[PDB]
Each structure stands twice: as structure tokens, then as C-alpha cells.
């Protein structure tokens, strides 16, 4: 995308989202990041929406194939699950490469740095969902380390109702439950996050209240599933 203007790539990413063309959206946003400038709040959301949708579809297909393969246990189901897995890993590696070159290192404000470190934890978590080899423990620890750094900044720099802080805690709680085999840590994190946000809702405008309560409901939905 090197020959297209940054502003045109952003415009086309927004069009691609409207047209439900998320692979295109992710390619446009990759091109925008590679221009080398920092991203605004709105642009960070376009980057996350694009890749979350692409990898979400891959994850769903991998789970369908993995279930068939496990019920089966010719080479075709395994081969095709491996093909989908390799493509998923390649998209995660691409996102992680954008974060490492050079989004995280140039992010100084708490909102941008927490956003990118949450993404880093998420894409290592997606790698961990399909990992089995000699690096699986290391992939899990890479997710944990990214989420932990994001948590440390968020607790120092953001109020307990901040939607980025809340979504980070939600996703790190999912990591604890589904990846790290730490359901008690998952439940504790979700409950403490929910309660501390509840106690800060009185400070918020109607529109901020709506955002914080939406994510608090996601925390509650998980606690209901886990308890």
C-alpha cells in the first residue's frame, strides 16, 4: 500500500468496514501503520476492528476443524486444520510485528500504550489457543507479560471506569480462565474490576456511563458463566 496516501488508506478502511470487507480493512490499516506516524484514537479502533474480525473468523474455522479432527481420532482433516492454523498464525505475527515496529515504542500516553499492549496480549493469546510445541509455555508467558504491563499502567493512569482499562481487564480475565488454567484468578479479576467500576459510575456523564456499563455487563456475563 506504499503508493497510497495515508488519508486515502484510512478512508478506504472505513468504507471496507461498511462493506463488511474485513480482509481489505486490515490491509488498508496495515498500510496506514506502515506510513510511520502515530495513530489517533479513531485510527487505533479501525486497526483493532479489522484484525479482530479477520482472526475471529480464522479462530472460528479452526475450532470447527479441530472438533472434526478430534472426533476422527486419511490425512485431509489434519492437513486442512494445519493450513487454517498456519494462516491464523501468520495474521497474528503480522499484528504483533506492527505493534513491535513501531507502535508500542512510540506510544507515550497511557491511552495509546495500554491499547497497544492489550492488543499484544490478545494476539499472543490467539497464538496460545493453537499452540502445542516447545514454545507454548513461552507464548503464554508473552501474553501474560503484555497484559500485566498494560494493567500496571492502567491502574496508575486511568480511572476504574475507563473503557480501555475495563476491556483490558475483561480480556486478561479470559486469558486467566481459558489459557492459563487459573479460573480463580479470572473470577477475582472480573469481580474486583466490576466492583471498582460500579463505585466510580457516579462521576460519569450519560455517554461515558453507557460505555462503562456496557463492558461491566460483559464482565458480569462471564462471572455468571464461571460461577
Amino acid at each position: 500500500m506504499g503508493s497510497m496516501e495515508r488519508a486515502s488508506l484510512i478512508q478506504k478502511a472505513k468504507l471496507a468496514e461498511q462493506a463488511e470487507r474485513y480482509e481489505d480493512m486490515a490491509a488498508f490499516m496495515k498500510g496506514a501503520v506502515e506510513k510511520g506516524e502515530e495513530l489517533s484514537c479513531e485510527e487505533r479502533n479501525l486497526l483493532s476492528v479489522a484484525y479482530k474480525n479477520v482472526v475471529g473468523g480464522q479462530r472460528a474455522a479452526w475450532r470447527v476443524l479441530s472438533s472434526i479432527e478430534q472426533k476422527s481420532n486419511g490425512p485431509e482433516v489434519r492437513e486442512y486444520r494445519e493450513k487454517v492454523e498456519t494462516e491464523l498464525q501468520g495474521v497474528c505475527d503480522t499484528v504483533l510485528g506492527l505493534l513491535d515496529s513501531h507502535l508500542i515504542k512510540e506510544a507515550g500516553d497511557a491511552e495509546s500504550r495500554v491499547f497497544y499492549l492489550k492488543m499484544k496480549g490478545d494476539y499472543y493469546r490467539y497464538l496460545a489457543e493453537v499452540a502445542t510445541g516447545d514454545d507454548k509455555k513461552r507464548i503464554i508467558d508473552s501474553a501474560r507479560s503484555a497484559y500485566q504491563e498494560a494493567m500496571d499502567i492502567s491502574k496508575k493512569e486511568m480511572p476504574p471506569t475507563n473503557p480501555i482499562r475495563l476491556g483490558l481487564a475483561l480480556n486478561f480475565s479470559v486469558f486467566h480462565y481459558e489459557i492459563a488454567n487459573s479460573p480463580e484468578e479470572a473470577i477475582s479479576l472480573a469481580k474486583t474490576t466490576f466492583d471498582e467500576a460500579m463505585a466510580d459510575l457516579h462521576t460519569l456523564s450519560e455517554d461515558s456511563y453507557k460505555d462503562s456499563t456496557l463492558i461491566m455487563q460483559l464482565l458480569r456475563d462471564n462471572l455468571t458463566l464461571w460461577t
Binding site: 483493532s48 474480525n53 475483561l170 480480556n171 479470559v174 481459558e178 462471564n222 458463566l225
Partner: peptide, 9 residues
Amino acid sequence: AGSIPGRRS
């Protein structure tokens, strides 16, 4: 268990 969605919807 659900993680955060890309958009509010």
C-alpha cells in the same frame, strides 16, 4: 466466555 468486541454493537 466473551472478550471485548471490536465495536459497541
